[PDB]
Design an enzyme around this catalytic site. Structure first.
Site, mmCIF file in Angstrom:
data_model
loop_
_atom_site.group_PDB
_atom_site.id
_atom_site.type_symbol
_atom_site.label_atom_id
_atom_site.label_comp_id
_atom_site.label_asym_id
_atom_site.label_seq_id
_atom_site.Cartn_x
_atom_site.Cartn_y
_atom_site.Cartn_z
ATOM 1 N N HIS A 36 -42.520 -58.189 -96.003
ATOM 2 C CA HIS A 36 -41.372 -58.524 -95.187
ATOM 3 C C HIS A 36 -41.783 -58.852 -93.776
ATOM 4 O O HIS A 36 -40.910 -59.263 -93.020
ATOM 5 C CB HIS A 36 -40.370 -57.379 -95.125
ATOM 6 C CG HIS A 36 -40.716 -56.124 -94.324
ATOM 7 N ND1 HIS A 36 -41.218 -54.967 -94.766
ATOM 8 C CD2 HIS A 36 -40.465 -55.938 -92.978
ATOM 9 C CE1 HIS A 36 -41.275 -54.109 -93.785
ATOM 10 N NE2 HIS A 36 -40.817 -54.695 -92.715
ATOM 11 N N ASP A 63 -43.335 -55.411 -101.812
ATOM 12 C CA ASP A 63 -43.364 -55.670 -100.403
ATOM 13 C C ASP A 63 -44.828 -55.711 -99.986
ATOM 14 O O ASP A 63 -45.377 -54.730 -99.493
ATOM 15 C CB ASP A 63 -42.568 -54.561 -99.669
ATOM 16 C CG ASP A 63 -42.314 -54.857 -98.185
ATOM 17 O OD1 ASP A 63 -42.773 -55.876 -97.682
ATOM 18 O OD2 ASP A 63 -41.655 -54.065 -97.511
ATOM 19 N N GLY A 141 -41.396 -50.997 -86.590
ATOM 20 C CA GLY A 141 -42.648 -51.473 -85.978
ATOM 21 C C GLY A 141 -43.859 -50.947 -86.738
ATOM 22 O O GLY A 141 -44.974 -51.502 -86.689
ATOM 23 N N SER A 143 -44.093 -50.873 -90.073
ATOM 24 C CA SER A 143 -44.211 -51.615 -91.334
ATOM 25 C C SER A 143 -45.557 -52.269 -91.396
ATOM 26 O O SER A 143 -46.115 -52.694 -90.388
ATOM 27 C CB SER A 143 -43.210 -52.731 -91.436
ATOM 28 O OG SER A 143 -41.937 -52.126 -91.334
ATOM 29 N N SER A 159 -43.579 -49.716 -95.944
ATOM 30 C CA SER A 159 -42.505 -50.625 -96.259
ATOM 31 C C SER A 159 -41.232 -50.302 -95.480
ATOM 32 O O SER A 159 -40.791 -51.164 -94.711
ATOM 33 C CB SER A 159 -42.190 -50.582 -97.756
ATOM 34 O OG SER A 159 -41.165 -51.561 -98.026
#
Lengths: 198, 4
Positions: A36, A63, A141, A143, A159
């Protein structure tokens, strides 16, 4: 730039995500991160400089993504823990109950335990299945960042999480956190990547 | 949970 798990990078001069792990694909340098975070061919920058582009990603459903770096980048078998480092030793998957820590540019290095595997997250974009849950906290932030054991076994990349209005789930007890990561092993075999270890 |  020195590529270390946990550090900030930007995507097309707008979003921020965190580096998951240094990897190679034959002679190509790259790092794994969350899907993402960018679309294919989105430009990744670290500290104002272009370090590479998104080569592939799957989001939602899964993801995951990897960014192919230019040759000038220095890949390192390490994940940031404050001013210190955790060495990446391999990617043995830890079981539920195991202790694990995660590293990212918003909340830094946080530890907790794995509480459940094969969870589905229902994000606005669609569901992402097969995620592992831990109760280490995290914030917007983080991720794409590293989830790793103290022993150096890379578990996966950040994720999502049940963040509160302050942007993280660090201010609610560990018992109420659901911080989810994408398992590393399927990302490595899906893209033919090898983990840089030390 | 939201992405991130």
């Amino acid at each position: 730039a020195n590529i270390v798990g946990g550090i900030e990078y930007s995507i097309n001069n707008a979003s921020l995500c965190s580096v998951g792990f240094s990897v190679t694909r034959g002679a190509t340098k790259g790092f794994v991160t969350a899907g993402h975070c960018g679309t294919v061919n989105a430009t990744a920058r670290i500290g104002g400089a272009v370090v590479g582009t998104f080569a592939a990603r799957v989001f939602p459903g899964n993801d995951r993504a990897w960014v192919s770096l230019t040759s000038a980048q220095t890949l390192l078998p390490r994940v940031a823990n404050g001013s210190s480092f955790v060495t990446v030793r391999g990617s043995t998957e830890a079981a539920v109950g195991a202790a694990v820590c995660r590293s990212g540019r918003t909340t830094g290095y946080q530890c907790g335990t794995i509480t459940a595997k094969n969870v589905t997250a229902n994000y606005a974009e669609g569901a992402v299945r097969g995620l592992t849950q831990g109760n280490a906290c995290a914030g917007r932030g983080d991720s794409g960042g590293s989830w790793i054991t103290s022993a150096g076994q890379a578990q996966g990349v950040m994720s999502g999480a049940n963040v509160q209005s302050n942007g993280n789930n660090c201010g609610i007890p560990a018992s109420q956190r659901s911080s989810l990561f994408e398992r590393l092993q399927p990302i490595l075999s899906q893209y033919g990547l090898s983990l840089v270890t030390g | 949970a939201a992405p991130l």
